[PDB]
Amino acid sequence: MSLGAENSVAYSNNSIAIPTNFTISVTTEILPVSMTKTSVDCTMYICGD
Amino acid sequence: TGVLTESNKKFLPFQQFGRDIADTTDAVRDPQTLEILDITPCSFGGVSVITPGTNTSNQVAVLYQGVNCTEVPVTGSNVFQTR
Amino acid sequence: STECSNLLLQYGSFCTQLKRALTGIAVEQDKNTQEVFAQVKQIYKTPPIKYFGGFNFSQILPDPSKPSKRSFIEDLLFNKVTLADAGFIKQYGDCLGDIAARDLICAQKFNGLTVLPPLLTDEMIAQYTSALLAGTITSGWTFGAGAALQIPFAMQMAYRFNGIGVTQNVLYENQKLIANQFNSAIGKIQDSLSSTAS
Amino acid sequence: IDRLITGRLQSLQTYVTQQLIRAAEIRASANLAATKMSECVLGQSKRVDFCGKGYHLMSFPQSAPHGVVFLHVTYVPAQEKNFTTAPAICHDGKAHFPREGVFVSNGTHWFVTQRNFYEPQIITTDNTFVSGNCDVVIGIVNNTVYDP
Amino acid sequence: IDRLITGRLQSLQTYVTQQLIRAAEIRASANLAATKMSECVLGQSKRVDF
Ligand SMILES: *[C@@H]1O[C@H](CO)[C@@H](O[C@@H]2O[C@H](CO)[C@@H](O)[C@H](O)[C@H]2NC(C)=O)[C@H](O)[C@H]1NC(C)=O
Ligand SMILES: *[C@@H]1O[C@H](CO)[C@@H](O[C@@H]2O[C@H](CO)[C@@H](O)[C@H](O)[C@H]2NC(C)=O)[C@H](O)[C@H]1NC(C)=O
Ligand SMILES: *[C@@H]1O[C@H](CO)[C@@H](O[C@@H]2O[C@H](CO)[C@@H](O)[C@H](O)[C@H]2NC(C)=O)[C@H](O)[C@H]1NC(C)=O
Ligand SMILES: *[C@@H]1O[C@H](CO)[C@@H](O)[C@H](O)[C@H]1NC(C)=O
Ligand SMILES: *[C@@H]1O[C@H](CO)[C@@H](O)[C@H](O)[C@H]1NC(C)=O
Ligand SMILES: *[C@@H]1O[C@H](CO)[C@@H](O)[C@H](O)[C@H]1NC(C)=O
Ligand SMILES: *[C@@H]1O[C@H](CO)[C@@H](O)[C@H](O)[C@H]1NC(C)=O
Ligand SMILES: *[C@@H]1O[C@H](CO)[C@@H](O)[C@H](O)[C@H]1NC(C)=O
C-alpha cells in the first residue's frame, strides 16, 4: 500500500509562504443517532401458545 | 490422529504418558519397543477468498493463513508469500 | 471428530455469529489505527539542514542507520513493552520444531485460536509519525488546514507565545534560554524512559 | 421441551447482549452528534479538524434516516507565494515588532501584512511596537519606520 | 459429547462477550487519541488540561 505522495517543503530561516487567494469548501459529515426499537415476547417465541 | 516423531523427552521409567495444558496427550510410550514418541496435529489453517464483485468478474484469489507456501497441497500459478 | 461435528450442527448458528463478532472486532482495530495515524495526505520530510532556531529534535526525528526508520524515543518505547510475537511469522513452522519446551502459543494454535497480523506495519506507523513531525516542525499548523506553508521555527514559537497570551518579545529576548530548557526537558524524557519501567 | 427451552433462552440472551453493546455504541455516536450540533451549528469552533477540515466558518444540519448530516463550510487558503521574512525591524537603535501580522519583503522593500492573506502595508509606528534594542534579537534587519 | 459441547460453547461465548466489551473500551480510547492528534499536534489548544 501507498501512504501518500512524497513532499519536501522548502524550509529556511528567512523564507515564508503566504497565501494570496482562498476557496470556500463545503464538506459532508454523517452521524448515526438512534436505531430500531424492538420488543420480544418470550412466551410466543420460546413456546408459541 | 497426528504425526509421530522421535523424541528427546526425559521420561522417567514409571511414566507412560505425557500431557498438555489443555489435557491432551503430547508424548506416548510405545508398548512393544520402549521408545518415546511425540504426537503433533497435522497441518491446517484458514482459507480466505479474495474476490471483486460477481458483476465484475468470477476470478478469485486464495489466501492460506499462517502456513508457508511450500506446504499448501498434498491464474493460480502466481504464488506469493506474505506475512 | 465427525460425531462431535454432527452433534454440533444441531445447535444452530452460534458459531457463525461468533465469527461475525470476531471479524467485526478485527476490522474495527485496523479502522482505529487508520483513523488515529493516517491524518496527513502527503508524506513530508525534514530538510537536510538541522537548525531550527536552537531547538534540538535529534531524538524524535528518524535515524536512517537502522533498517526500521524509528527515532531514539520510539526505540526506547518499543524496547520497554515486552510484546509477544503472537504467532505472526509462520507459527506452524516454529511449532513443528523438535523442542522439549512446549509453548503456550503452540497450544493456542493447535486448539484452533489464531492471531491475525495488523494491516499497517510498524514501519508505516513510523513513516506517518515522521511525516507529522516534519510537517509540524517545518510548517506549523498550516499543513493541517490545507497546503504546508513554510515558516522559521522562531517565528512559529512566537506565534505560539502570542497564542497563549505572551508578547513575542519575551520569546525573542529569551530564545536561547527557552531552547536550553526544551533540550533539558527532552533529556529528562530520555532519562525517565531509560530508568522508570512503570 | 426443556432442551428446546434452554436453547431458545440462550439465543434470546445472546440477542439481548448484542443489542445492549450496539446501544452503547449508538449512544456514544449520538452524544458526539449532539456536541457537534451544539458547537458547529450554534457557534463557531476553534478546535482543529472538529467541524470540518480547514478554518471553520459555518455549519448546517440536515435530517437523515436514523441520523444527521452536517454541511461544514470552511475556509481554505489557495495560492501561496514566497517572501523574505524577519522577526523585527531595527530603526534608530530600536527593535520594532509587528502588532498583528508578519514582516515580508519582495526583494527591495519591506512591508507588514496579515498572516492568512497577502495584504501588504507600509510599516508604521501605528502597526508596530517598540521593545528593547537591536543587539538581542537574532535575524533583525535595518529599515525605516514611518511616522504619520 | 453433548455435555462437552454445551460447556465449550458457553466458554467461547463468554470469551467473545468479554472481547466485545474490551473492543468498545479500546475504540473509545482510540477516538480520544485521534481527537488529541487532531487538536494537539495539528494546532494549538485553549482547553485546560487537554
Ligand atoms: C482567486 O480565485 C478565484 C477562483 O476561485 C478567481 O476567480 C476567477 O477569475 C478568473 C479570471 O478573472 C475568471 O475567469 C473565473 O471565472 C473566476 N472564477 C470564479 C469567479 O469563480 C480569482 O481571480 C482569484 N483571484 C486572484 C487575485 O488570484
Ligand atoms: C542534539 O541532541 C543529541 C542527543 O540525542 C546530541 O547528540 C549526542 O551528543 C553527546 C554529547 O553531549 C554525545 O555523547 C552523543 O553520542 C550524541 N548522540 C548522538 C549523536 O546520537 C546532539 O549533539 C545535539 N545537537 C546539538 C547540541 O547540536
Ligand atoms: C516590491 O514592491 C514594491 C511596491 O511598492 C515595488 O515598488 C514599485 O514597483 C513598481 C513596479 O512594479 C513601480 O512602478 C513603482 O514605482 C515602485 N514604487 C516605489 C519604488 O515606490 C517594487 O518594485 C517591488 N520590488 C520587486 C523586486 O518586485
Ligand atoms: C540560516 O540559514 C543559512 C542557510 O540555510 C545558514 O547558513 C545559517 O547559518 C542559518 N542561520 C543560523 C543562525 O544558523
Ligand atoms: C515383545 O517384543 C519385544 C520387542 O519387540 C521383545 O523384546 C519381547 O521379547 C517380545 N515378547 C514376547 C513374549 O515375544
Ligand atoms: C518458509 O518460507 C520461507 C520463505 O518463503 C523459506 O525461507 C523457508 O525455508 C520456508 N520454510 C520451510 C520450507 O520449512
Ligand atoms: C518557493 O521557493 C521554493 C524553493 O526556492 C520553491 O520550491 C517553491 O516552488 C517556491 N514557491 C512556493 C509557492 O512555495
Ligand atoms: C544596521 O545599522 C547599524 C548602524 O546604523 C549597523 O551597525 C548594522 O550593521 C546594520 N545592520 C545590517 C544588517 O547591516
UniProtKB/Swiss-Prot annotation, chain A:
Glycans are attached at residues 13, 21. Changing residue 8 to L: In strain: Omicron/BA.2.12.1. It comes from the Viruses. Precursor of the fusion protein processed in the biosynthesis of the S protein and the formation of virus particle. Mediates fusion of the virion and cellular membranes by functioning as a class I viral fusion protein. Contains two viral fusion peptides that are unmasked after cleavage. The S2/S2' cleavage occurs during virus entry at the cell membrane by host TMPRSS2 or during endocytosis by host CSTL. This is Spike protein S2. The gene is S. The chain holds residues 697 to 745 of 1273 of the full protein.
Swiss-Prot record, chain B:
Glycans are attached at residues 55, 68. It comes from the Viruses. Changing residue 22 to D: In strain: Alpha/B.1.1.7. Binds to host ACE2. RBD also interacts with the N-linked glycan on 'Asn-90' of ACE2. Cleavage of S generates a polybasic C-terminal sequence on S1 that binds to host Neuropilin-1 (NRP1) and Neuropilin-2 (NRP2) receptors. Interacts with host integrin alpha-5/beta-1 (ITGA5:ITGB1) and with ACE2 in complex with integrin alpha-5/beta-1 (ITGA5:ITGB1). May interact via cytoplasmic c-terminus with M protein. May interact (via N-terminus) with host bilirubin and biliverdin, thereby preventing antibody binding to the SARS-CoV-2 spike NTD via an allosteric mechanism. Attaches the virion to the cell membrane by interacting with host receptor, initiating the infection. The major receptor is host ACE2. When S2/S2' has been cleaved, binding to the receptor triggers direct fusion at the cell membrane. When S2/S2' has not been cleaved, binding to the receptor results in internalization of the virus by endocytosis using host TFRC and GRM2 and leading to fusion of the virion membrane with the host endosomal membrane. Alternatively, may use NRP1/NRP2 and integrin as entry receptors. This is Spike protein S1. The gene is S. The chain holds residues 549 to 646 of 1273 of the full protein.
